[PDB]
Structure formats: C-alpha cells, structure tokens
Amino acid sequence: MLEKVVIANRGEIALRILRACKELGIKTVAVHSTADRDLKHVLLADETICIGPAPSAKSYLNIPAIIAAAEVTGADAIHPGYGFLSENADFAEQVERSGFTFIGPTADVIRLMGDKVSAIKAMKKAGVPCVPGSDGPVSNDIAKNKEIAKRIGYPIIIKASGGGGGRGMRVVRSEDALEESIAMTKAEAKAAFNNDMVYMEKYLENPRHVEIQVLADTHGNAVYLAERDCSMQRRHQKVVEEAPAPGITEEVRRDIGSRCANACVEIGYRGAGTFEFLYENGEFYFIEMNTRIQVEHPVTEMITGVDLVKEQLRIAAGLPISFKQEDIKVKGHAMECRINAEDPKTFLPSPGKVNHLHSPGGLGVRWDSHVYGGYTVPPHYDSMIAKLITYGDTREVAIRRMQNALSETIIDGIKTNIPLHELILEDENFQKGGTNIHYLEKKLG
Amino acid sequence: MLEKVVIANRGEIALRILRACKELGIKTVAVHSTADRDLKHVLLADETICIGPAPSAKSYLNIPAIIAAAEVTGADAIHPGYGFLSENADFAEQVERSGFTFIGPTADVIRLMGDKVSAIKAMKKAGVPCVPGSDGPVSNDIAKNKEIAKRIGYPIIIKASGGGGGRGMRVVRSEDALEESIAMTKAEAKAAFNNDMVYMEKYLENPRHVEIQVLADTHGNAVYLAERDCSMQRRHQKVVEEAPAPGITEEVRRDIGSRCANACVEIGYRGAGTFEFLYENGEFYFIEMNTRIQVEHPVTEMITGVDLVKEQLRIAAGLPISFKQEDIKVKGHAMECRINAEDPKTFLPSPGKVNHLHSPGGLGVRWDSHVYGGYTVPPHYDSMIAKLITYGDTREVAIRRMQNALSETIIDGIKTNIPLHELILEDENFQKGGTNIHYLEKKLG
Numbered sequence: 027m028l029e030k031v032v033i034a035n036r037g038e039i040a041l042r043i044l045r046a047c048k049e050l051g052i053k054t055v056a057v058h059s060t061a062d063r064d065l066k067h068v069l070l071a072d073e074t075i076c077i078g079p080a081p082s083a084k085s086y087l088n089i090p091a092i093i094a095a096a097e098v099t100g101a102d103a104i105h106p107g108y109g110f111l112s113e114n115a116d117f118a119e120q121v122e123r124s125g126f127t128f129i130g131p132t133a134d135v136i137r138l139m140g141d142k143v144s145a146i147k148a149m150k151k152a153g154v155p156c157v158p159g160s161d162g163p164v165s166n167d168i169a170k171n172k173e174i175a176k177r178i179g180y181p182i183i184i185k186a187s188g189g190g191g192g193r194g195m196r197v198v199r200s201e202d203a204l205e206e207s208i209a210m211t212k213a214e215a216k217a218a219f220n221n222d223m224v225y226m227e228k229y230l231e232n233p234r235h236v237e238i239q240v241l242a243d244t245h246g247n248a249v250y251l252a253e254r255d256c257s258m259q260r261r262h263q264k265v266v267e268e269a270p271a272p273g274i275t276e277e278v279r280r281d282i283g284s285r286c287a288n289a290c291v292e293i294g295y296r297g298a299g300t301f302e303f304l305y306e307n308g309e310f311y312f313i314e315m316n317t318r319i320q321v322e323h324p325v326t327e328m329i330t331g332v333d334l335v336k337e338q339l340r341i342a343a344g345l346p347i348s349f350k351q352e353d354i355k356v357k358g359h360a361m362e363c364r365i366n367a368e369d370p371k372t373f374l375p376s377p378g379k380v381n382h383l384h385s386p387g388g389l390g391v392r393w394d395s396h397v398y399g400g401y402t403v404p405p406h407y408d409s410m411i412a413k414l415i416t417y418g419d420t421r422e423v424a425i426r427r428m429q430n431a432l433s434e435t436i437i438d439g440i441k442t443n444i445p446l447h448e449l450i451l452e453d454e455n456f457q458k459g460g461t462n463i464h465y466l467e468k469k470l471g
Numbered sequence: 472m473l474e475k476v477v478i479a480n481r482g483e484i485a486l487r488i489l490r491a492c493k494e495l496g497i498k499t500v501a502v503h504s505t506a507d508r509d510l511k512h513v514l515l516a517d518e519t520i521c522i523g524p525a526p527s528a529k530s531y532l533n534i535p536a537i538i539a540a541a542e543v544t545g546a547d548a549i550h551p552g553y554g555f556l557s558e559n560a561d562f563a564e565q566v567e568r569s570g571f572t573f574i575g576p577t578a579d580v581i582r583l584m585g586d587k588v589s590a591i592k593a594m595k596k597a598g599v600p601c602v603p604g605s606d607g608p609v610s611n612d613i614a615k616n617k618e619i620a621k622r623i624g625y626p627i628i629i630k631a632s633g634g635g636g637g638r639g640m641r642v643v644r645s646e647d648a649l650e651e652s653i654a655m656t657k658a659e660a661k662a663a664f665n666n667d668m669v670y671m672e673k674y675l676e677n678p679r680h681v682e683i684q685v686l687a688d689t690h691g692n693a694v695y696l697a698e699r700d701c702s703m704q705r706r707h708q709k710v711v712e713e714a715p716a717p718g719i720t721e722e723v724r725r726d727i728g729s730r731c732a733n734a735c736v737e738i739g740y741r742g743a744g745t746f747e748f749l750y751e752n753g754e755f756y757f758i759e760m761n762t763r764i765q766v767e768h769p770v771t772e773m774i775t776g777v778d779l780v781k782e783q784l785r786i787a788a789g790l791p792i793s794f795k796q797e798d799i800k801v802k803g804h805a806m807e808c809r810i811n812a813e814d815p816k817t818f819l820p821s822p823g824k825v826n827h828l829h830s831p832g833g834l835g836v837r838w839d840s841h842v843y844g845g846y847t848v849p850p851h852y853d854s855m856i857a858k859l860i861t862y863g864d865t866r867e868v869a870i871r872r873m874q875n876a877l878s879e880t881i882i883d884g885i886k887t888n889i890p891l892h893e894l895i896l897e898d899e900n901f902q903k904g905g906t907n908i909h910y911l912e913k914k915l916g
C-alpha cells in the first residue's frame with residue numbers, strides 16, 4: 027500500500043523484491059551500477075536510474091545517489107535487501123530524515139542490535155538465553171578478567187562489540203594467555219572499527235547455527251516462523267540451509283520462538299528479522315541479530331506458507347502482519363543450495379558469459395535467480411548466481427528432490443559449486459542430520 | 472516399490488514421470504522415437520530403447536515394440552502417461568497378460584469407463600448424478616425417441632457411445648429434426664468406431680467443465696482431491712485450468728466427491744482417475760471418466776499437497792494411498808497455462824529451434840517442461856512445450872503471479888500462445904471467475 031519502491035540492491039534479491047512489488051501493484055525503481063544494466067530486475071522495473079560506476083563503494087554504497095533516486099522518482103520507500111546498506115543505521119537515518127520509509131527497523135534499533143554488547147544486554151533483559159559471558163564489556167584489570175573466565179570455564183572467546191564475520195574474535199584456551207588476548211583484540215578492534223569495546227563468551231566447541239525468523243508490525247504484533255539450520259558452511263560462507271532444524275520439537279520451538287517475539291515488542295522492533303543462536307547440548311544461546319531479510323528466507327517460506335518480502339512491504343506501509351501465531355503450522359521440510367559462479371574446490375570467483383542455462387523444475391522445486399542464457403556474471407560483486415530451493419513432506423524427500431534438481435541443472439561457460447552441493451547431499455552424516463558448523467571444513471580437509 | 476518402469480510416453484509428462492521415479496529410487500527405461508533422442512527425460516533415463524521412426528503410429532502407438540522394451544530390460548511396470556495408449560484397454564490387457572504391471576486401472580475397467588453408455592450406467596448405479604437422458608441407447612422407433620426427447624426437453628444431444636472429442640455429437644433443437652439426427656449420428660458412429668450405439672442427453676447450453684480427481688488403491692481405499700475448472704477452452708483444446716472451481720463450497724465438494732470415491736469402490740477402480748462433470752445452475756452432471764493421469768494434474772497438487780504421479784506408482788506397487796480423506800484440506804488456489812508452440816491467433820503449429828529459453832521462478836511459480844535452450848520442437852507430435860503453474864493464497868494472487876511469470880517468460884525462435892494467456896488473464900469476466908465453456912471462442916470472435 028506504498029505507491030513506489032526503490033530497490034536499493036542487485037542480483038537475485040532485487041528480482042525477489044521486484045516480484046513482491048509487482049504482485050502488490052507497487053511501482054518499481056531499479057537503481058543500478060553501469061555494470062548491472064542487463065540485470066533481469068532492471069529490464070523488468072517500471073523505472074531505472076544509474077547510481078554510479080561498477081565498484082560497490084561508488085554505486086550500491088552511494089547514500090546520496092540512492093536518496094536522490096527516491097527524490098527524483100517521487101518514491102515512497104526504499105528496500106535495501108541484504109548486504110550493502112541493509113544494516114547501515116546512518117543510511118536508515120538519512121532515508122527517514124529525507125521523508126521516505128526505510129523497509130526495515132528504525133535507525134535507533136538497527137544501531138542497538140548492530141552493537142553486539144547492547145544487543146546481548148537487550149536479549150538478556152527480554153529473557154532470551156545468551157552464551158554465559160562477561161555480561162557487558164571486560165576491564166583491563168586482568169584479575170577481574172581471569173575470575174570471569176574461571177566462572178565461565180575455558181575455552182572462552184573474546185569478541186569485538188563492533189565486530190563480525192570472524193574479524194574480531196580470539197579463542198583463549200588457558201588463563202596464562204588471557205591478558206594479551208584481551209589487550210590485542212581491544213587494539214585490533216579500535217584500529218579496525220574505531221571501537222575498542224570487547225566482551226567474553228564461553229567458546230562453544232561443536233554448536234549448530236540455528237536462527238529464528240520473526241516479523242513485528244506497527245500494531246504491536248510480533249510472530250516467530252520456526253527456525254533454520256545454517257550449520258553447513260565454510261569460513262563464514264553459508265553453503266546449504268534447511269528448515270525446520272532437525273531435532274527441534276514443537277514444544278522447544280514455541281518456548282524459544284515466543285521469547286524472540288516477546289523481545290521484538292520490548293525493543294520496539296519493526297519488520298523482518300533473524301535471531302541467530304548457537305545450539306549445543308540441546309540448549310539455545312543467542313549470539314546476534316540480523317535486522318534485514320536474509321538470503322535463506324525461502325526455506326522458511328516453503329515450510330510456513332508465509333511470503334516474507336510481502337510482509338516486509340505490508341509492515342512498511344503501516345499494515346498489520348497478514349496472519350496470527352496460531353495460524354502458523356510447520357509443514358514438511360525445505361532445503362536451499364546457494365549456487366555460486368566459483369571453482370568448486372578453490373572457491374576462486376568464476377566470472378564470464380553463461381552460454382547456456384538450464385534451470386530445473388517440477389513439483390517441490392523453486393528457482394530464485396537473476397541468471398539467464400547469455401547473461402555475463404560480472405567480477406565486481408559476490409559470486410551467488412541462483413538459489414535452488416526444494417520442499418518435501420520429509421527431510422529425506424527434500425534432499426532427494428535437491429539431488430535430482432541439481433542433476434538437471436546446466437550452467438555452461440563458467441564453473442559453479444554444483445559439484446560441492448552434490449558431495450554434501452550424498453554425505454551420510456548430512457543425510458542423518460545435525461552436523462555442526464565445522465563439519466564441511468573437516469570433510470573438505 | 473517397483474524396481475524398473477518403462478515411460479511409454481514423451482515430452483513434459485515423460486519428464487514428470489521420470490522425476491517421480493527418481494524420487495522413489497525406481498529405475499527408468501525411456502522408450503523414444505528416432506525424432507525424440509534429444510528429449511530431456513531420454514537424456515536423464517537409466518536406460519533408453521528406440522521403439523521406431525518419428526510418426527506416432529510407428530513408435531508411441533507400437534504395442535509390440537513397447538512390450539518388447541519391458542521384456543528386454545526386465546522392467547516390472549509401464550506408465551502410459553496421457554494420450555497415446557493410456558486409455559487403450561487392448562494395450563492394458565497385453566501388458567498384464569505379458570507379466571508387467573500397467574500403471575492404471577485393469578483392462579476390464581478401462582473398457583467399461585471407455586464406453587460412454589456403460590460408464591453412465593455404472594455412475595447412475597453408484598448414485599453419481601448424470602445428465603437427464605435416454606438412460607441407455609436409443610431405438611430406431613422414432614415414437615419412443617420423441618417421447619424421451621419430450622420428457623428431457625429440447626434442445627437434446629445425440630452422442631456416440633464409442634465417441635469423443637466432439638466427433639459423434641449432434642444437438643437437436645426441435646422434434647421435426649430428431650429422426651434423421653439419430654439415424655445420421657448412428658451411421659457416422661458405425662462408419663467411424665464400427666459402433667452404431669448412440670444415446671440422448673439434455674443439451675446444457677451454458678455449463679462449466681468441472682472435474683473431480685480420485686485415487687483408489689488395492690486396499691479398498693478411495694479418495695477425492697477437490698476439483699478443477701477447465702472451462703477456459705477452444706474447440707475441445709483446454710488452454711487454462713484452475714483449482715479449486717470458483718463457487719464450489721466445502722459442503723458441495725464433500726457430497727459430490729464422496730459419491731465419486733464411493734463409485735470407485737463399486738466398480739473396483741484402481742489408480743488415478745478423473746470424473747468429468749458439466750456444472751450448470753448450481754448442479755453437477757457426470758458426462759465421462761478419464762482413467763489416466765491428466766495434463767492439468769499439477770493444479771490439484773498445488774492446492775492439496777498430494778504428489779499424484781507418486782501415488783500412481785505406490786498404488787501400482789500394491790501399496791495403500793499415503794494419506795486418508797480427513798488428511799486432505801484445500802488450501803489456496805492454483806492456475807495452469809498450457810504453453811504451446813503455435814501461432815497465438817491461427818493456432819497453426821510453430822515447430823523449430825528454441826534459440827533462447829528463459830523460464831520464470833520465485834515463490835508460488837512452478838514450471839513443468841522438457842524444453843531447453845537449443846531444443847528443436849518437432850513437427851510429428853502435439854504443440855505443448857510447457858505448463859506454467861502458479862499458487863496463491865487467493866484466486867487473485869494466483870492470477871497476478873501467472874501474469875508476472877508470463878511477462879518474465881522468453882521463448883525465442885518459435886511462436887507461442889503466451890499472448891493468448893495474457894489476453895485471458897487480464898479479461899474482467901475471467902478475473903470475476905465462473906465463465907462457461909463457450910466464453911473463449913466468443914471472446915476470440
């Protein structure tokens with residue numbers, strides 16, 4: 027019920043956002059780099075504005091150019107997608123100050139959940155279980171620090187509050203090492219983020235990565251939409267996601283989900299979001315929140331019947347969420363494979379012309395991709411070219427349908443990670459379910 | 472739980488059958504004409520046998536060659552798909568006599584529901600409502616005939632029992648014409664089918680084509696899977712199908728569905744089937760039964776969660792249907808567009824090389840097609856190249872998603888009927904729902 031939306035993103039998620047806009051009769055403005063003129067969503071959009079040359083810093087991260095796009099088109103709202111400016115509170119602030127709706131939370135709440143210490147504080151206050159830790163930043167008084175570490179038990183992990191993606195993290199296995207690890211992490215944190223704030227958690231040695239999807243609206247409603255297991259990853263890059271998380275009962279989901287929904291109301295959350303947990307020894311530990319739509323949102327859609335991007339658009343127009351918690355039932359199982367233009371062993375990007383695309387289909391097969399026969403994958407951005415999503419009444423059907431869909435898929439003229447997906451899907455530990463976050467790297471070693 | 476299946480068909484349905492086989496770990500034998508060597512399902516099958524040259528009569532209708540294929544491969548069963556030999560009782564007889572399972576009903580029951588008079592007799596005996604009519608074949612005693620016609624009320628329609636596809640049908644508007652119409656229809660029936668048997672029904676002037684999907688198993692179970700509205704058609708060729716039928720309540724569905732399921736048990740039906748009704752003035756009238764999987768089966772799959780081809784395979788292996796009637800709930804709405812290689816106004820076939828295919832995707836979009844970039848559509852068979860299927864929580868969402876999916880679809884180097892689909896979907900009468908079987912021809916005139 028917004029009239030015109032600026033799609034402040036590219037590739038598959040820009041197409042996903044365009045499809046939601048068109049279904050709702052919302053006009054589309056595609057802002058694009060010089061290199062993305064032939065993107066599928068650009069070709070489909072009602073209006074197009076070039077916002078700069080190919081490099082990200084000059085185009086998709088260009089805050090003045092994106093806001094000027096909304097200004098000259100008379101747009102009502104900006105959808106930032108994921109990556110780029112989606113979790114930039116300064117961008118969100120400039121968008122609302124400039125008279126447009128940011129499709130996401132308020133700038134205040136992005137900054138609060140963006141800072142890991144303040145995020146944990148707020149979840150703890152809401153009764154969301156957190157990793158045992160310093161519960162606040164650590165001192166330089168090493169005597170205090172060693173007692174904290176002793177209470178928690180080694181190994182512990184020192185984290186930058188302004189950290190992320192594995193940069194500002196140090197595992198500590200014994201006390202004789204604690205002192206310099208805090209001081210070093212503190213120094214690299216101030217050097218990198220201009221933010222020397224660090225905290226300690228217990229280091230969980232073999233967790234699963236389980237994340238809970240929420241929506242919260244401007245009507246005081248908040249819902250949980252089960253969870254995703256994103257454990258199948260390599261050096262901080264997710265490869266395969268699934269929903270629901272194997273081993274999670276409806277009883278456990280309702281408990282942890284309701285605490286998440288409750289925390290949304292407490293913090294005045296607005297839009298789609300994700301509570302990231304580490305899951306180990308049948309217990310949940312909050313680590314951080316994503317204040318954006320995520321890559322792997324389709325697996326949640328396939329097991330709940332919810333259109334997450336459409337709910338984003340409704341919530342931004344000031345409408346309530348289109349359903350209630352009791353209306354949500356988990357049905358069956360969904361798998362997603364991130365198909366990347368990369369070497370399947372070296373993970374070196376594989377840019378170039380797709381000479382032939384053959385996308386799979388049939389019952390329970392979903393294909394989310396901007397890629398087409400004769401499209402050139404550019405060097406300037408990430409390597410993701412498609413998300414192949416399968417549904418089944420059971421986990422086993424979902425896996426077998428993914429195997430059959432991958433065997434039908436042809437991407438000619440570039441390397442992809444399809445051979446890696448095929449290795450993962452036929453792995454006996456993966457077929458059993460519940461492998462931890464380190465499993466793929468061990469398997470590859 | 473069969474080990475090896477001969478796919479006695481081609482094009483999209485052969486691929487649909489292969490996908491079901493692979494999901495169940497069933498080995499595939501692709502029998503193919505010389506012209507279909509590059510069919511997608513042939514390229515994917517475990518084994519391939521050329522059963523003759525390109526013409527249908529010499530290949531897909533070649534009963535000895537198909538049975539010899541099952542013999543040399545040690546296959547257990549034959550899936551006939553739709554068209555070709557799927558409703559040929561002589562073929563079904565030869566398959567079971569030769570020691571293989573025919574994926575479909577017994578030969579006796581194909582012949583019974585294949586003959587329109589004996590079919591109506593059996594439905595009438597089961598308490599399935601039928602068009603008022605002669606209730607049996609008509610005499611040559613015109614005095615008897617005129618009294619029958621008088622009882623029913625003009626206009627009436629004379630039909631060949633061995634008829635179908637509009638060949639052996641004569642509308643009669645007044646009594647002074649009845650006598651020769653019976654005698655002429657009788658003469659063309661004996662000349663065509665070597666079967667001079669004809670019956671009368673009341674001629675329904677503005678009906679909808681509503682059909683009920685069933686499964687019946689070797690365990691005495693029979694289920695109904697709501698219904699499809701297939702009214703959007705031109706000169707006996709379906710163009711757009713939808714499920715459920717607009718205006719049909721759960722109360723009416725349960726009544727007419729249960730009578731269909733009951734009739735399955737009475738006649739010892741086995742496998743998938745379709746009860747075809749004419750629906751007019753809020754009443755159902757059985758006209759004929761299809762004893763095969765149908766083109767438009769995906770719309771039923773999208774509103775019920777049932778895998779119809781997988782149930783075919785289970786039932787043939789002697790397993791029960793995987794669910795019970797009370798497990799089936801209609802959820803949302805589905806649309807199918809038959810995409811044909813044909814001129815969108817003249818309907819002349821458009822064979823030739825597909826230089827570029829761009830298939831649509833995203834949430835609620837399903838693509839069932841054997842077509843790929845660089846595939847040549849042959850002249851020898853039907854013009855269907857793809858089925859585009861959309862799901863929505865409402866009829867309105869299903870239609871809008873079909874419009875958006877069609878606008879994304881590119882088939883380069885041949886003509887298609889995509890422009891006709893686009894005309895149909897934006898028609899205000901179609902958006903309101905419930906248009907009769909004559910509507911598309913009037914619109915086109």
Ligand SMILES: Nc1ncc2cc(-c3cccc4ccccc34)c(N3CC[C@@H](N)C3)nc2n1
Nearest residue numbers: 157183190191192227228229230235259262463
């Ligand atoms: N207390 C505690 N214990 C174990 C952890 C293990 C990781 C971790 C390390 C390496 C890969 C990962 C992939 C998914 C989820 C977590 C990880 C981790 N990360 C990765 C980056 C940052 N978001 C946090 N934090 C952890 N925290």
Ligand SMILES: Nc1ncc2cc(-c3cccc4ccccc34)c(N3CC[C@@H](N)C3)nc2n1
Nearest residue numbers: 602628635636637672673674675680704707908
């Ligand atoms: N009593 C009575 N009243 C109206 C009918 C109208 C048709 C008919 C005529 C023309 C197109 C059709 C399309 C779908 C369904 C039916 C039709 C019809 N058909 C078409 C071929 C054959 N299967 C029967 N039978 C009818 N029977």
Ligand SMILES: [Ca+2]
Nearest residue numbers: 302314315316
């Ligand atoms: Ca995060």
Ligand SMILES: [Ca+2]
Nearest residue numbers: 747759760761
């Ligand atoms: Ca029929």
